[PDB]
């Protein structure tokens, strides 16, 4: 899944 700081 995407890293914590995605979006």
């Amino acid at each position: 899944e995407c890293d914590k700081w995605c979006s």
Partner: antibody
Amino acid sequence: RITLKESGPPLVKPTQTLTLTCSFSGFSLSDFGVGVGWIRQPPGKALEWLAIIYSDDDKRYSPSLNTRLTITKDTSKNQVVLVMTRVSPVDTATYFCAHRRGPTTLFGVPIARGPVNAMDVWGQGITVTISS
Amino acid sequence: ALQLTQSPSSLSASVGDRITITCRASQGVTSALAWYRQKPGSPPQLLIYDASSLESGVPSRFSGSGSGTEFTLTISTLRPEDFATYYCQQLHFYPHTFGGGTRVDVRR
């Protein structure tokens, strides 16, 4: 100045449980968005990412080792602990913990996420040998 | 999972050379990529974060560029302390992968 240092047993026997402690200074695991991760390096091999934990307590693990790893933090003692169960010889490696910055804030407002893209300060590493 | 391939795996050079190491990802990682230099017996040291930002206290001969799936680290004027192994690390997707490393040694 941020510094981290790993501690635990240098020798461990197969099937046993390995508990590694990362004690640090210069930051708090209560600071905004900060992370502390663990990376290992078998002798002569490449770095391998293991897990990371953030100050808001989100935890993430390497999918290949997920079932054997537990990472936890003790904010008031400035320590992060990684517990690996059922070790075997292939787990012999030098284990490093490392700091990960949280986003830069301006008057407590997140304005830059570029600084989270790296593990910026590392501990010297602790050598662990798994043999019966 | 996501694959990070470094090239070349090994590279020979001399003091004063310009070298460039490249790292390619199997899926785009935006700019979430870091470069490290690791000298024998020591922990890796952060050189470049967020694909191109120079880490504080790191000498200016180190430079990083690229985004998406292709990144490069170039050391413009190799110094003796640069004979070492370099690694790239992706931080866009979990797990936060490392490349295989590229060893830079004294050419002869």
